[PDB]
Amino acid sequence: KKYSIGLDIGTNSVGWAVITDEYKVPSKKFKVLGNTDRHSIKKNLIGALLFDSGETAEATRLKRTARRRYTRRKNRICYLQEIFSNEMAKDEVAYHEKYPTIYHLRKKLVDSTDKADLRLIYLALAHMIKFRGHFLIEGDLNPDNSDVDKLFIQLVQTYNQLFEENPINASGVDAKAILSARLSKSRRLENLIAQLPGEKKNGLFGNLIALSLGLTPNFKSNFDLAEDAKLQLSKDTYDDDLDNLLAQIGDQYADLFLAAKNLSDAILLSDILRVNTEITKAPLSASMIKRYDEHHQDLTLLKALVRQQLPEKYKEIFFDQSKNGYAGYIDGGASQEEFYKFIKPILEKMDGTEELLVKLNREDLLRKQRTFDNGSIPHQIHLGELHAILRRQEDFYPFLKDNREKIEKILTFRQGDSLHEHIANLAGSPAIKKGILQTVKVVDELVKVMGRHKPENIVIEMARENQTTQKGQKNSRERMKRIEEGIKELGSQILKEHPVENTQLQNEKLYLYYLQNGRDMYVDQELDINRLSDYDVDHIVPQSFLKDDSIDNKVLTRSDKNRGKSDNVPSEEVVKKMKNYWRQLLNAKLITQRKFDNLTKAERGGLSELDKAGFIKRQLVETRQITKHVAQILDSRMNTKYDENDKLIREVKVITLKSKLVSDFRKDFQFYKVREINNYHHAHDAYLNAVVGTALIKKYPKLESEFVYGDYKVYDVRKMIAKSEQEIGKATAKYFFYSNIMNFFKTEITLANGEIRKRPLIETNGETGEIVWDKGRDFATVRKVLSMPQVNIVKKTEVQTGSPTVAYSVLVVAKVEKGKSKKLKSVKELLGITIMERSSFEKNPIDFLEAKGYKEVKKDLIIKLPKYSLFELENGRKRMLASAGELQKGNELALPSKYVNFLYLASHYEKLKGSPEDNEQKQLFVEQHKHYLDEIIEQISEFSKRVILADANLDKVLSAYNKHRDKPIREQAENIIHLFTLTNLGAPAAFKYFDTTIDRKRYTSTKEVLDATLIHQSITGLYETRIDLSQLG
RNA sequence: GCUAGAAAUAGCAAGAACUUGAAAAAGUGGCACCGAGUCGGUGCUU
């Protein structure tokens, strides 16, 4: 019936789930192929695909290659020729002297009314089509997406959004006056750095601006990388270099560099448009002409000066060509930087060299027309020049009038290539590109499974990479530098009387204690250093208005009753008393401008419609561009119908969600996530994403434009927010007065005063009268879904493509010679095929095997076995094929939800980060159910006895658990979480218990696989083909 | 390209599995309900 798909895209896993209207996951019967007696299996429509990174055919197909680009461009030229064909069917010296560069021809064709030869017109059009420019800016050129100021603000906004801890606030800066000024790149960089006292040229932001100006910054110090990663936007090989860089540090910084590129284009766009002589001209071509003219002037001046003053070495400049001279610059293989390095001392020595040096320092002296800068030209400019030329030559050529929109669409449409090329064009690491391809294939298979019925909704989450612990110190270092700078600026030696290190500053209440100068925020009294348990953590902006649990919106105080009776920010009576202390904490860079604004928001009226809209946009809109591109790919592949007009019929809505929504949903209703148990949590996150997405699109359809990707009817702030909290409640079409979007999930709403508001048991849409949430059946359903033990975890088997390396193994049945008599004995062996041997084997397998020493091979039974091939043995125990002589664990430990929640609460004991009432009730819940620990150990034991089969390790960990049974529950739960690594899917890894270290238990024997059941799994695992290998022989 | 010279050589100018296919590529895996130890059972219907 009606359904929706939830997706959790990551770098090592892709979670997927299908939900119905009642938020249930269907369980269906699937056919089982092969030659066994099992012909049907019942499977739950929920799972997660796993795929380790590596060298694969698919991977190379998704990499950018010169050849694919080349054929693309060639195709475009072919189309252009096809457009000119039907009418075409019905000088060198002159050209070069009249137009010494193509930009002369272009500017003439845009600014000349005279009739031109059609061949030159074709040359111009082909040059504009072949190198059409980037598509990072969407739509027509306008100051909103073109001026340097707005894009610089957008860059620092993206920066602060990506970090928010120690962010940069830039309001006084005049980005236009600094970046657009006519000076050298390095001097512009230093001039911008001078306006930011907290950042330096070698910092991350400094390196980003340097990258945007056209320099070659080094990002090793910003990310501590082992290998040097240099980036230059103008260089043609920047994209794959960025893809390498992003692969090292993750794709979260991808959008950052994208904004940097945009800033570069903006600076260039202001640098090119500055020489705007006439309003109706062609700025790019005219500027290239001016560059040519300056080149010509400087050239003739150089020859004059050289001939008069320096007769010697003229041949070295214009005749030798072997040492990168001017003759080498024009006729030889000498780059612009080499020519500058060669001609710098000649200009330094000579007299009468004024004016040439100010151009030399600005890197605009004797420039060529084919240089590294043309990659930055947007396509809207070429579209403008094309429109101008078409308008000038409209009456002369009728087919330009007839095919104007055709040519324009060919240049602007993004022709339509393959899906592999669309994924290859993306800006990200090969991992997320692989994941995107896998996601598309997963969607295709899922809609195939549902009788070719497309879902109503496809909810997308970009799964976050949990902390790798190398970053667990970086955050502590940044907050530590903030504390040290604030203390040194103020002058209160709290660190002298109470020394602390960056390790202890991870605690929320201690970090807030040091952020607040060891003083109460609301009262003029010193805080007790060793009585923080009695102290409460208050939210500057209540949770009823906005879900912000960062340090930016948190304070530490002895009692949260001091904020007063209002549900808003703390009252003016406290602000008036503490304004001096808050202004000293403000000017000491202990807090940001926004935090001071929120603390002092009652002085400027209180919450406003603009503030609530800003909160909604902060919570509901996704800033990451990569997510929008994934949604674009899925939307284009899923939605392809139209109507009579040129309007796209959107049958499937692609909803984009933030991780904070699902995380807070788990934390608020105790649907806790523990990644260490098994790999099911990806699928579970996908399911909860589907639930949350469907709930938001059903409750607030008019807010689709905020999350759903597409071109929808725009909206404002008046129709959304009610005048009064209660006096307009349930009597207007306004959806919500409180700015937190996730309130409709809650049954009750606790405000900042303590009054507990009640909401109906059944949530329905106001306009259409459709039930959107049943607060009873749906929570029971969610818990039931999280309790299901059968979740489809599939490891993508891949042939390796790129101490020899085995591409894949093969199952061979034949006979061999044994003993002195050379008697033939039938054998079945696992042979490893090297990457080199793969071609020869696929060319002629039998001859290869006969050369290897096998006799009488059965060609039909030769079975290809890539890495991670799954085999099943007795009692459902499963093993994956790692190599020709080693196996990996193939089972997933399914743990009941009650034990998962108990384990989370035991581990998250000190870091609950919640209200005291529920925190104490959770503590009592953990303490009362200590027996659950023994129960959990029993679970792993039975599970281990069934599928792991490691008696020695099990005895060791059982004994080690028996020695430390009386230890506290927190550390005990942590050591059980560590102990779960023994049963984790994949390769055995060494893990640490309380004082024990359990070494890996390798599986060196491989003979049993030869008589097990090989299970060929589809990408989702719903479709299985099971081959009983014991029957082959 | 311009001037000389038998040349050589000199002066100048200027800008997963399976099926079909060679391949790209097309195809192959029923619907509800009660449960839930890696999925089981029942009804309908191929």
**Per-position DSSP letters for A241-293, written without gaps between them:** HHHHHHHHH-GGGHHHHHHHHHHHHHHHHHHHTTS--SSSS-HHHHHHHHHHH
Q: How was this structure determined?
A: cryo-EM
**Cα(A462)–Cα(A455) distance, integer angstroms:** 20
Start-to-end CA span in chain A (Å): 46
Does the nearest atom of strand B lie within 7 Å of A223's Cβ? no
CA of A516 to C1' of B41 (A): 63
Amino acid residing at A229: A
Does the nearest atom of strand B lie within 7 Å of A103's Cβ? no
**Cα(A1030)–Cα(A1033) distance, integer angstroms:** 7
CA of A720 to C1' of B38 (A): 47
Are A810 and A833 in contact by the 8 Å Cβ rule? The answer is yes
User: Which distant-in-sequence residues (6+ apart) come within 8 Å of A130 by Cβ?
Assistant: A73, A76, A77
Q: Which nucleotides of B are covered by protein (CB under 7 A)?
A: 13-18, 25, 29-41
**Cα(A956)–Cα(A983) distance, integer angstroms:** 15
The residue with tokens 């041997």 is A837
Q: Is A465 annotated as a binding residue?
A: yes
CA of A1025 to C1' of B44 (A): 27
Q: Is A964 annotated as a binding residue?
A: yes
Q: Is A995 annotated as a binding residue?
A: yes
Q: Considering only CA atoms, which residue is closest to the C1' of nucleotide B37?
A: A789
Tell me, rounded to whole angstroms, the distance of Cα A49 from its chain centroid.
Answer: 18
* Ramachandran angles phi, psi of A653, nearest 5°: -95, 130
Burial of residue A362, with CB atoms counted within 10 A of its CB: 0-12 exposed, 13-18 middle, 19 or more buried: middle
Lookup: nucleotide whose C1' is closest to A894 CA: B38
Catalytic (active site) residue A379: no
Does the nearest atom of strand B lie within 7 Å of A318's Cβ? yes
Q: Is A295 annotated as a binding residue?
A: no
Does the nearest atom of strand B lie within 7 Å of A67's Cβ? no
Which of A104, A379, A539, A908 is catalytic? The answer is A539
Lookup: nucleotide whose C1' is closest to A40 CA: B29
Dihedral angle of Cα A946, A948, A949, A953, to the nearest 10 degrees? -130
Which residues in range 873-912 of chain A are in contact with strand B, contact meaning CB within 7 A of any of its atoms?
876, 891-894, 896
Q: Considering only CA atoms, which residue is closest to the C1' of nucleotide B41?
A: A42
Q: How far is CA A925 from CA A613, A665, A786, in A?
A: 39, 20, 20
CA of A696 to C1' of B26 (A): 39
Lookup: nucleotide whose C1' is closest to A97 CA: B15
**Cα(A433)–Cα(A436) distance, integer angstroms:** 5
DSSP 8-state assignment for residue A643 = -
**Cα(A853)–Cα(A1024) distance, integer angstroms:** 34
Are A48 and A803 in contact by the 8 Å Cβ rule? The answer is no
CA of A1018 to C1' of B18 (A): 12
Does the nearest atom of strand B lie within 7 Å of A41's Cβ? yes
Burial of residue A649, with CB atoms counted within 10 A of its CB: 0-12 exposed, 13-18 middle, 19 or more buried: exposed
Lookup: nucleotide whose C1' is closest to A99 CA: B15
Lookup: nucleotide whose C1' is closest to A1014 CA: B17
**Cα(A270)–Cα(A276) distance, integer angstroms:** 10
Which residues in range 414-433 of chain A are in contact with strand B, contact meaning CB within 7 A of any of its atoms?
418
Resolution, given in Å to one decimal, reads 3.2
Helix, strand, coil share of chain A (percent; to 5): 50, 15, 40
Write the DSSP assignment of A75-123 as a string of letters.
Answer: HHHHHHHHHHHHHH---HHHHHHH-SSHHHHHHHHHH--S---HHHHHH
**Cα(A192)–Cα(A203) distance, integer angstroms:** 13
CA of A37 to C1' of B31 (A): 23
Catalytic (active site) residue A528: no
**Cα(A805)–Cα(A336) distance, integer angstroms:** 43
The half-sphere exposure of A218 on its side-chain side, counting CA atoms within 13 A, is: 7
Q: Considering only CA atoms, which residue is closest to the C1' of nucleotide B36?
A: A788
Does the nearest atom of strand B lie within 7 Å of A1017's Cβ? yes
Which residues in range 945-984 of chain A are in contact with strand B, contact meaning CB within 7 A of any of its atoms?
946
Which of A8, A251, A520, A664 is catalytic? The answer is A8
User: Which distant-in-sequence residues (6+ apart) come within 8 Å of A36 by Cβ?
Assistant: A1013, A1026, A1027, A1028
A709 torsion bin: left (phi>0), alpha (psi -120 to 50), beta (else): beta
**Cα(A942)–Cα(A894) distance, integer angstroms:** 12
How long is chain A?
1033
Tokens of A197: 């006292």
CA of A829 to C1' of B22 (A): 33
CA of A698 to C1' of B29 (A): 33
